[PDB]
Design an enzyme around this catalytic site. Sequence first.
Site, PDB file in Angstrom:
ATOM      1  N   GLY A 129       0.819  -1.292   0.110  1.00 17.24           N
ATOM      2  CA  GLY A 129       0.041   0.119   0.053  1.00 17.24           C
ATOM      3  C   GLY A 129       0.827   1.215   0.131  1.00 17.24           C
ATOM      4  O   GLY A 129       1.826   1.318  -0.085  1.00 17.24           O
TER       5      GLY A 129
ATOM      6  N   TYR B  82       2.822   4.326   1.461  1.00 14.41           N
ATOM      7  CA  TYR B  82       3.583   4.446   2.485  1.00 14.41           C
ATOM      8  C   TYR B  82       4.802   3.257   3.059  1.00 14.41           C
ATOM      9  O   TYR B  82       5.471   3.451   3.968  1.00 14.41           O
ATOM     10  CB  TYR B  82       2.942   5.100   3.791  1.00 14.41           C
ATOM     11  N   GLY B  83       4.332   2.184   2.594  1.00 14.93           N
ATOM     12  CA  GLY B  83       5.164   0.879   2.961  1.00 14.93           C
ATOM     13  C   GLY B  83       4.678  -0.337   2.316  1.00 14.93           C
ATOM     14  O   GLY B  83       3.347  -0.487   1.990  1.00 14.93           O
TER      15      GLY B  83
ATOM     16  N   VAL C 117       5.022  -4.650   2.863  1.00 15.60           N
ATOM     17  CA  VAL C 117       5.543  -5.858   3.760  1.00 15.60           C
ATOM     18  C   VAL C 117       5.664  -7.151   3.236  1.00 15.60           C
ATOM     19  O   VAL C 117       5.054  -7.543   2.471  1.00 15.60           O
ATOM     20  CB  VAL C 117       4.262  -5.853   4.900  1.00 15.60           C
TER      21      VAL C 117
ATOM     22  N   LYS D 227       8.602  -4.636   7.243  1.00 16.34           N
ATOM     23  CA  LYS D 227       8.156  -3.409   6.432  1.00 16.34           C
ATOM     24  C   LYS D 227       9.445  -2.512   5.937  1.00 16.34           C
ATOM     25  O   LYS D 227      10.073  -2.321   6.773  1.00 16.34           O
ATOM     26  CB  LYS D 227       7.118  -2.885   7.311  1.00 16.34           C
TER      27      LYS D 227
ATOM     28  N   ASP E  97      -9.467   1.565  18.029  1.00 17.35           N
ATOM     29  CA  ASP E  97      -9.956   0.998  16.827  1.00 17.35           C
ATOM     30  C   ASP E  97      -9.707  -0.560  17.196  1.00 17.35           C
ATOM     31  O   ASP E  97      -9.095  -1.485  16.360  1.00 17.35           O
ATOM     32  CB  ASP E  97      -9.353   1.330  15.550  1.00 17.35           C
TER      33      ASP E  97
END
Length: 341
Positions: free
Chosen positions: A28, A30-31, A33, A47, A154
């Site tokens: 995605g 931003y980084g 994995v 990551k 969350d």
Amino acid sequence: GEAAMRDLIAELHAMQSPYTVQRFISSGSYGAVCAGVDSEGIPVAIKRVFNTVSDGRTVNILSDSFLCKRVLREIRLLNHFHHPNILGLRDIFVHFEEPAMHKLYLVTELMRTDLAQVIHDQRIVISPQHIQYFMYHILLGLHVLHEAGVVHRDLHPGNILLADNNDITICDFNLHRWYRAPELVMQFKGFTKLVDMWSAGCVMAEMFNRKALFRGSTFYNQLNKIVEVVGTPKIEDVVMFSSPSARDYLRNSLSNVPARAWTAVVPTADPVALDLIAKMLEFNPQRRISTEQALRHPYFESLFDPLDLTEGLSERFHFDESVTDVYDMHKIFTAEVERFN
């Protein structure tokens, strides 16, 4: 996908890293994995934070003030705890290269599964003994976060991780509508750590039921599903924990509904278990059971030890948000990698 793995393998090789990149996990903005293995055989999630296409043009994360600050906060939070129930940093390393070519690597233990997968697997028996054990560890992880002034906000089965050894670890505290406390559904800005107690109560009922408790699809129908179970709250209490916009949405809402018998909501929960669930699911956070009182509840009598309330706690987390300079933040990353090693 295939490029992320190739980039990581080469970079880790240049570094003489103790890792072996086995497969691609997720990608995605931003980084990316990748699932790898450490020098001892233990599975890890690696990551790689490098670039993104923010606002149309390619931006280096560690070079942009806002994005750099966002990642520094996620990292500082991960590195703040050292507790069995809180997912920690296994490793952290930064590769700084002058013309916005800065890279950040984050290593965490790759867990066997999560609680959402366990709940939904019909082949898996979730006994009352398993529920008590999982809940004890879920609440200890929340207690540890809350003792450091950190609110998860969350919590859901998808971020409650199970190790091969069935050890419970909470993740994503450093970043569904079905687990949101009434005050978050009503967009109250003054929410507190009690929102997590509501999510935990939803998770507890869900492990008994094998189905989420409040499966709404809208602001009104989510609140209706909640009130159908908990009973109509006093209007004076609604106004105290709603935004001005939410009060206006609920302005002409007629509600004169009695609380349901808890035996009907969670049929397989025994009376002691029901008593705790009903206390976690108080509509008003001012009357909602605290983590310490939930941990001290007779439901956990066979597991509880007062030492669990104080062992491995971290001090209050502080992040200075006045920081804006990317070079000032880079020093904090170096300082965060230093205190780590």
